[PDB]
């Protein structure tokens, strides 16, 4: 929800299955006994659907790979020659 607040109206991860999970919750409400097992099963199904859509969003929509490559180049000094030249230039400034 917080991302859809900033992200354009990208629908629920569960989309039309959200209502399906609502129906499952209504069935749970119709259950005469509260079973933690069935509740956890439904929660895990919803979680898995959400997690798969989130992974898709992260990799394609949020370009996790590009960010990881950036982190490698900068945080992990992937551009080692670049940071070497930077050190070579900044050595006199940073010695003080």
């Amino acid at each position: 929800e917080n991302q859809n607040v900033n992200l354009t109206r990208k629908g629920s991860i569960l989309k039309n299955q959200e209502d399906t999970f609502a129906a499952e919750l209504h069935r749970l409400k119709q259950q005469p006994l509260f079973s933690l097992v069935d509740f956890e099963q439904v929660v895990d199904r919803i979680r898995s659907t959400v997690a798969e859509h989130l992974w898709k969003l992260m990799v394609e929509e949020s370009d996790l790979l590009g960010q990881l490559k950036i982190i490698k180049d900068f945080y992990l000094l992937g551009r080692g020659e670049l940071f070497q030249a930077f050190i070579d230039t900044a050595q006199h400034m940073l010695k003080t």
Binding site: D19, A22, L25, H26, K29
Partner: protein, 50 residues
């Protein structure tokens, strides 16, 4: 026509709701603010945009 209105149309004048009950789908009924946002606010925003 005059006599029809005064007698026959007078005789044949047997010309004698928003079910806002949450009871049906209370679990599926949106919150009052959520229901408002989804039924009124989207339409209000549409008219505003137009």
């Amino acid at each position: 026509i005059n006599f029809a209105r005064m007698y026959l149309e007078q005789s044949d004048f047997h010309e004698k709701d928003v079910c806002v009950d949450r009871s049906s789908e209370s679990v599926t009924c949106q919150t009052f603010e959520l229901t408002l946002r989804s039924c009124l606010y989207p339409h209000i925003d549409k008219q505003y945009l137009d």
